[PDB]
Design a protein around this ligand. Structure first.
Ligand SMILES: Nc1ncnc2c1ncn2[C@@H]1O[C@H](COP(=O)(O)O)[C@@H](O)[C@H]1O
Ligand SMILES: Nc1ncnc2c1ncn2[C@@H]1O[C@H](COP(=O)(O)O)[C@@H](O)[C@H]1O
Lengths: 458, 458
RNA sequence: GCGCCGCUGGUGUAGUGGUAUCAUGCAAGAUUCCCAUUCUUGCGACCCGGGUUCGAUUCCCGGGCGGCG
RNA sequence: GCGCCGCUGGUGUAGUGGUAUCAUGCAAGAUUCCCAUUCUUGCGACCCGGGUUCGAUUCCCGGGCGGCG
């Protein structure tokens, strides 16, 4: 786990990721994600989407990566430059950049987003996408690259109605908070309950509180260990950072920054286009002339949690990376079964032909159930292929053995990657089992309780 | 349907997509996809992934969008330029471009891809991602833009073993083929069966045949009508194009081009790095000196189906776009229930408070079942809100009515967007129903057969 | 690209050297209890920059964007 | 960025002005019938360009990339 060299090796060898254009020499700070890396990235993203977007009914959008210079001048990003400069169309009349963040488009599409939500508040938009920084010296691999996938969430809330109705769901949750006070006081982080936290005013409100809870739950869900995960409040526009402890030290992997008055303002000035919600009045005010007002203009506070996926990924790598006891050439990852690149591996004992039927029958069966599987029927022994599949963090292994070919209820075995423990179950309900473990409704323990274990080949 | 102005209007108004940076004046050929557009895009992509990637067990990868000039010189793309030019890092020693296609990275990562598949053939890689063209005059909206999402598939096959074992699944399929012969002969396309097609040699092989079948099935699955969908063979490196008929005419939406000798070669020359598979020999040849050879080097043929998602999207728009009979202000889309941005809309009759419970209870219930839903509890009448939800192509509508508040088995109604037909079913199994219709296991007809219809409010 | 006009609430429009008509839409209220009901009330716009003018959204010049070869 | 070395099959390495050692890995065969078994056989490499040389992967110069401030 602590050994970054072994890990880096296992990552490179099995093509989790790799230096970009390595046949042309490679280019620093640019990385390509192979089959397993891509699969893990995708799984992580799907989980994120159905964690925040579905649960909060967030308006997600696709925006363009190119950006006209005036847009990035209004936001003060422009101000030898760390952005990627190009030109648009025919000639150099219209210079643009590659977006440094996927936040801007949301703001620039605010009016239509607000209309879509019927003009009502609060409302959340979000953008999952690639952003680009012309860093000078990228090191640490994924930690500092020049192009990367981030998932951003914009929460637009009435400055006067900033109080979240789903907060008692995250109320009893215990986190490591690293407040600015504790930082200037030469102290360390503290394990507080969330509600206690907001009461004592360490966390401004229950919206930031709720977000912090959910963000926690997500980051732990994908495989980050709580003990090495904290929330450091920014110190001298109130920002909180979800940070993880790695071999490189404490790195920022999520940025929760909540800034009221704005760039929404900025753009509204530069373009002279009001970007403002409106709230009807319970009691219409009359104000020269008699002039009753029935609505008030509202520029909404904005909470912005932005997730850096390269770093969430890497953190998962370091925390999950384990080495077996005995054969230390055998390494594996401990990916949670909901993000594992492959939930299942389909393996026969030896190259014996009578195994070919059941292998295919179930491989076509797992697909029908939508399970990501890797069927390994190559030359080497069962132990070797296990080492291979464990190495890429395959969650479970289905072994077809001689007792599969000679039994009335045809049974195969199911091996837990982590524990090296096995059970034996009929081949007809194996896809059901695997599928459900991959969708987190049950863990390995309950499978171990529901089915008879593997004691030996009869 | 034929009316592009009405459609364009409904697209703009409900924010399916919109001109990029419109508050800054907008920029031609760049478009941002709102909530519904993004949802449809995502659904389409998920369906694509579980259509090709899962079923063929394709090695999917994430590659970088930036690209060093030598890479694109080897591929002869460079040769006032239609690509987006920038520089990498500190200064202008290292100029690069924005990838015009997501194909290159796959080739550049070929060796590790081939190793991952144990060196065996055949094997498929694929890349879903954005590509960039500095077009001069973009028109037709999505048809010709400057940045767009394409999904590419690389199939690597032994030139001598080009014969697909899953072809009898697409054998009895009937398509419109537009062969080059028919084109130079002043004829039109022909509705051939696929197997007949390959026998008479109009389609070179059963791999191109199989791909063509699957591509067909996919494009029809997402909502493209067969009658306005054909496969035109390229005429004077054998290429086939999946084309659709729109108001703009026949446009190319998928490119199936199958070119043996290569850019794999090109890169292998420029970099001096052999990109070649190897095949063991059944009978080891002995060839001066006695020198037995046991493997032959094989440069594999490559089949490349590339999908243009902007165009597949637009095609879906034009084909699905319908206008009601009577109130022609009422327009709707006929999105297949597997790609519909929202499968369900949750609607009460009137603003009456006693409806608030059941609405929430099921909205939290649909989420638990993972169903994308839009709960509309706004001021206007049921007809207005229907018009709204139909307008964005919501697949089904759940109506909470007075008979929901006063019945022992609490029942609500389910309305079919297309037909305007309704049924009535208990609120406890509604998420099940909706969920399954959204996962294509049953159609509306079987629901209409399984449940009692809506005849009137008791 | 090059060309002939054009750009007014979210959408569709009338109008003029003295800051804007009507319809739809969206909210709130009341009606209404199945398919944009009705009434009331409220919300929102002259694509940018420069020039000419006492004053331009209107006239002229140049961005940008759109329709079409 | 600037700096001190460095780059040899997929990975880890020995070696030298005359084109490369060993281990692992991956295939095929045979053993083996639960956790990288064993034997046999096969597959694969000197990061690029220039210079000096009869000849460089080795020496020098400059790309690129990596480790580290
Ligand atoms: N050079 C970079 N490489 C990887 N991630 C980055 C980089 N810069 C910013 N991020 C991500 O940005 C998030 C914080 O937002 P910000 O620091 O404002 O960009 C973190 O989650 C990071 O993962
Ligand atoms: N300017 C463009 N806009 C949208 N799609 C494009 C464009 N150029 C190529 N494509 C897509 O590329 C595919 C065919 O490949 P190719 O024409 O070689 O790029 C089609 O499916 C198109 O959708």
């Amino acid at each position: 786990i602590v050994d970054r060299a072994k890990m880096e090796d296992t990552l490179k060898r099995r093509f989790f990721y790799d230096q970009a254009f390595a046949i042309y020499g490679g280019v620093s700070g640019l990385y390509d994600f192979g089959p397993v890396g891509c699969a893990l990235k995708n799984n992580i993203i799907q989980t994120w989407r159905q964690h925040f977007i579905q649960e909060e009914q967030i308006l997600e959008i696709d925006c363009t990566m190119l950006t006209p210079e005036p847009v990035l001048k209004t936001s003060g990003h422009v101000d030898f430059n760390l952005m990627f400069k190009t030109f648009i169309g025919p000639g150099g009349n219209m210079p643009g950049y590659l977006r440094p963040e996927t936040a801007q488009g949301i703001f620039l599409n605010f009016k239509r987003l607000l209309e879509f939500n019927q003009g009502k508040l609060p409302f959340a938009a979000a953008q999952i996408g690639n952003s680009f920084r012309n860093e000078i010296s990228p090191r640490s691999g994924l930690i500092r690259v020049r192009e990367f996938t981030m998932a951003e969430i914009e929460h637009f809330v009435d400055p006067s109605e900033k109080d979240h109705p789903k907060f008692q769901n995250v109320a009893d949750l215990h986190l490591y908070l690293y407040s600015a006070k504790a930082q200037v006081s030469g102290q360390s982080a503290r394990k507080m309950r969330l509600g206690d936290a907001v009461e004592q005013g360490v966390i401004n409100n229950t919206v930031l509180g709720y977000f912090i809870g959910r963000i926690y739950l997500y980051l732990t869900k994908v495989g980050i260990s709580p003990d090495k995960l904290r929330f450091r409040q920014h110190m001298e526009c109130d920002c909180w950072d979800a940070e993880s402890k790695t071999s490189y030290g404490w790195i920022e992997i999520v940025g929760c920054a909540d800034r009221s008055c704005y760039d929404l303002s900025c753009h509204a000035r530069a373009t002279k286009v009001p970007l403002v919600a409106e709230k009807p009045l319970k009691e219409p005010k009359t104000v020269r002339f008699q002039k009753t007002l029935y609505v008030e203009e509202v520029v909404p506070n904005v909470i912005e949690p932005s997730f850096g996926l390269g770093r969430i990924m890497y953190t998962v790598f370091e925390h999950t990376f384990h080495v077996r006891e005995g054969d230390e050439q055998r390494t594996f990852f401990s990916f949670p079964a909901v993000v594992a690149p492959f939930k299942c591996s389909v393996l026969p004992l030896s190259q014996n032909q009578e195994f070919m039927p059941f292998v295919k029958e179930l491989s076509e069966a797992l697909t029908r159930h939508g399970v990501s599987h890797k069927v390994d029927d190559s030359s080497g022994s069962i132990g070797r292929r296990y080492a291979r599949t464990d190495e890429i963090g395959v969650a479970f292994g289905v072994t077809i053995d001689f007792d599969t070919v000679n039994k009335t209820p045809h049974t195969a075995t199911l091996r837990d990657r982590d524990s090296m423990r096995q059970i034996r179950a009929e081949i007809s309900e194996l896809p059901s089992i695997v599928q459900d473990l991959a969708n987190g409704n049950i863990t390995w323990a309950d499978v171990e309780a529901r089915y008879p274990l593997f004691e030996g080949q009869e």
